[PDB]
Design a protein around this nucleic acid. Structure first.
Ligand SMILES: [Mg+2]
Ligand SMILES: [Mg+2]
Lengths: 313, 141, 100, 52
RNA sequence: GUUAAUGUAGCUUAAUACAAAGCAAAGCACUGAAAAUGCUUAGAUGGAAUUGUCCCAUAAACA
RNA sequence: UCGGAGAAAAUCCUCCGAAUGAUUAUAACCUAGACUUACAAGUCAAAGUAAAAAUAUCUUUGACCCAGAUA
């Protein structure tokens, strides 16, 4: 009786939700399925905004609105890296590319694929872009002041599961200008096979201390051999981990498209493969000579062919 | 032809390949408890004494998309932390983040009294107009 | 009759297998486990059975549970026993059907 | 006391099903699924079968 | 002068990070009252270390 | 004969009830896998299809033969 009693449902709900998160000795569901200058500046603006009567009037008249672009730019500078890191880990980029190592993104990298001439499709984290839209190389811009920019097909390999294909890699990029990068790998369009799901493509940016000869990494131009596009980021960055530290991220998802047929035929010059999603066969207990109290259908579950046979006759 | 060598079985490792296809399992039990856990992605809206928040969380429990008045950029342009317009705005902020993240389908579980609340109705209007769907599609067996 | 636990914890269970019978709710459905009108518990997936304790939250609409839940003291909340099955197989895989 | 009665479909088909009603209340009439037409239609009481 | 001091907002040994947090408390509406519910209100790190003592503002008693 | 409570899985052991009734916005067809059980009878149910815009809750009888009723 000493303890007070919850007066509303919400109080119990929130307490229960917190209770679940805390560890417990008994078995539970989770086990199995699992500076000061700024502050002074910040306060001044808030008092100014509070003083503004027009803001108060608009709020109580429920007509106010907020500029999206300004918030987006502010979010990127202040705490965008923290949110950006979450997405990469959720999509498995860290575990599959760096074997579990984590690097916080810092440069608000920007990419967009030019569509025709009037418009250009942006490439955020987790966006969906068709292979046709990615036929040509995109426009890349970032605030710097060397660099290496890299492309991967994380899950598009057709023979070896671990390996991945390069689209193009520029090295020895000075400052922001990108035309000065060495074209180690010429650009190729995405080619995800039909019926094989969603593939994730990643944009990587590494800070370069001093220019390094990537002669071994360089691929011939033009190169249409898949045996040469295969590589591993983990070992690749191991040989350059002294002068290379990642600083950028951007990825998108793409499905099959008609252009993919052209890529496999015209330049890859091979027959395109087709994949289908197959479910495991249904489970049936072992067959019995006498199926007591089972319907006539019992015999159908164990037959292979649907057409009659006549044996010796 | 070297290029024509292909393994019999493809192995996509995308953590969201099956979920987007619609062929991934959703937990179907919890018939004596509220709320139902048969969702790929769920939206939780929390109202505190001084702040209002909203999260998108996967079944395992990891938050993927989050918007909160605690975020600095939001408040500096925000007159009041607890307003009907603020609920609309935080929803609009969340909506844009979801679309770029690619989370086009979601589910919401408003309690009866909370559902009647005008602010929540306004928030739903913000999400639906932005095009985030508040009911997931049925699984394909 | 013979009310009891048909399938004990740590046993491979196929889809449709009945796990428990009960006149009253001694156990509650959990993950991938359904309810029969007679209140029996069956498995909705192939996997391993597990018994675990967990917090109980009722539907808002039902009166009796809400009345009791709010009346509980601030210190703690009531618990219950839940049943879950852990799936043990991938639902499907991709295979090469044709080269065109 | 209660009486068992036969409800007949008014779709032109002969489909019927048996229901229960207390002898005190009026004759029953209901909506029900008609398999032959594959639609919901009215069923109207036509005859008495037995008293239970 | 020595103690004792009291030193993020009623409370918290919230926090120093990507926020000065959570809770208590307040107004109006909703008619038995209260509670619940919806819409609203007002706020603080004296200030450090170093944390899981100063430090001076302050400070009764010591004096 | 069947069901509920104690003894506690024995009894000619200690008790109460049942051979229904009320409300029903009307609850289809088809089908993996299981419980219960000497036999016979009795329970629960994914997916698919169909009507609609998913389950009616209260909670307990009788084989075969042989005669009925109508369409
Ligand atoms: Mg039998
Ligand atoms: Mg079904």
């Amino acid at each position: 009786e000493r303890l007070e009693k919850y007066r509303s449902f919400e109080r119990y709900r929130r307490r229960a939700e917190q209770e679940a998160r805390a560890p417990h000795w008994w078995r539970t569901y989770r086990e199995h399925f699992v500076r000061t200058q700024k502050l002074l500046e910040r306060k001044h603006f808030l008092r100014e905004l509070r003083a503004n009567v027009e803001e108060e009037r608009a709020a109580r008249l429920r007509t106010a609105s907020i500029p999206l672009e300004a918030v987006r730019a502010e979010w990127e500078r202040t705490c965008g890296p923290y949110h950006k890191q979450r997405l990469a880990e959720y999509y498995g980029l860290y575990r599959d590319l760096f074997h579990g190592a984590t690097f916080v993104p810092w440069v608000p990298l920007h990419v967009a694929y030019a569509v025709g001439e009037e418009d250009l499709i942006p490439v955020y984290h987790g966006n969906e872009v068709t292979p046709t839209e990615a036929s040509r190389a995109p426009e890349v811009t970032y605030e710097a002041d060397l660099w290496t920019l890299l492309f991967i097909n994380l899950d598009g390999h057709l023979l070896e599961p671990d390996a991945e294909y390069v689209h193009w890699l520029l090295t020895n990029i000075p400052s922001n200008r990108v035309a000065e990068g060495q074209e180690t790998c010429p650009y190729l369009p995405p080619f995800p096979a039909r019926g094989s799901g969603f593939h994730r493509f990643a944009f990587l940016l590494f800070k370069q201390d001093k220019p390094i000869n990537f002669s071994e990494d360089t691929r011939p131009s033009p190169c249409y051999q898949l045996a040469q596009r295969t590589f591993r980021t983990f070992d690749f960055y191991k040989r350059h981990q002294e002068a290379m530290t990642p600083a950028g991220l951007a990825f998108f998802q793409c499905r099959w498209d008609d252009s993919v047929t052209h890529t496999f035929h015209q330049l890859l010059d091979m027959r395109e493969p087709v994949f289908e999603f197959v479910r495991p066969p249904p489970y049936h207990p072992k067959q019995k000579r006498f199926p007591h109290e089972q319907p006539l259908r019992y015999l159908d579950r164990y037959r292979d062919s649907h057409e009659p046979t006549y044996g010796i006759y | 032809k070297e290029n024509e060598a292909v393994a019999p079985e493809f192995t996509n490792r995308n953590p969201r390949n099956l979920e987007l296809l619609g062929v991934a399992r959703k937990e179907r039990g919890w018939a004596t408890v509220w709320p139902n856990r048969e969702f790929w992605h769920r939206l939780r809206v929390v109202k505190t004494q001084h702040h209002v928040e909203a999260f998108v969380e996967h079944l395992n429990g990891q938050v993927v998309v989050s918007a909160s008045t605690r975020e600095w950029a939001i408040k500096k342009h925000l007159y009041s932390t607890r307003n009907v317009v603020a609920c609309e705005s935080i929803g609009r902020v969340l909506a844009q983040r979801c679309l770029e993240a690619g989370i086009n389908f979601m589910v919401y579980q408003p309690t009866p009294w909370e559902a009647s609340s005008d602010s929540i109705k306004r928030l739903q209007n913000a999400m639906t107009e932005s095009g985030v769907m508040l009911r997931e599609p049925r699984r394909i067996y | 009759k013979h009310y009891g636990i048909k399938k004990m914890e740590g046993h491979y269970v196929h889809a449709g297998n009945i796990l428990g019978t009960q006149r009253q709710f001694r156990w509650h459905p959990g993950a991938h486990v359904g309810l029969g009108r007679n209140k029996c518990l069956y498995a909705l997936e192939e996997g391993i059975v597990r018994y675990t304790k967990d917090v109980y939250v009722p539907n808002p609409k039902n009166t009796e549970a809400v009345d009791l839940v709010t009346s509980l003291p601030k210190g703690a909340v009531l618990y219950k026993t839940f049943v879950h099955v852990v799936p043990a197989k991938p639902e499907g895989t991709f295979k090469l059907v044709d080269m065109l | 006391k209660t009486i068992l009665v036969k409800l007949v479909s008014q779709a032109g088909t002969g489909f019927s099903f048996n229901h229960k009603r207390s002898r005190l209340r009026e004759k029953l009439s209901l909506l029900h699924y008609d398999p032959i037409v594959n639609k919901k239609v009215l069923f109207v009481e036509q005859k008495k079968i037995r008293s239970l």
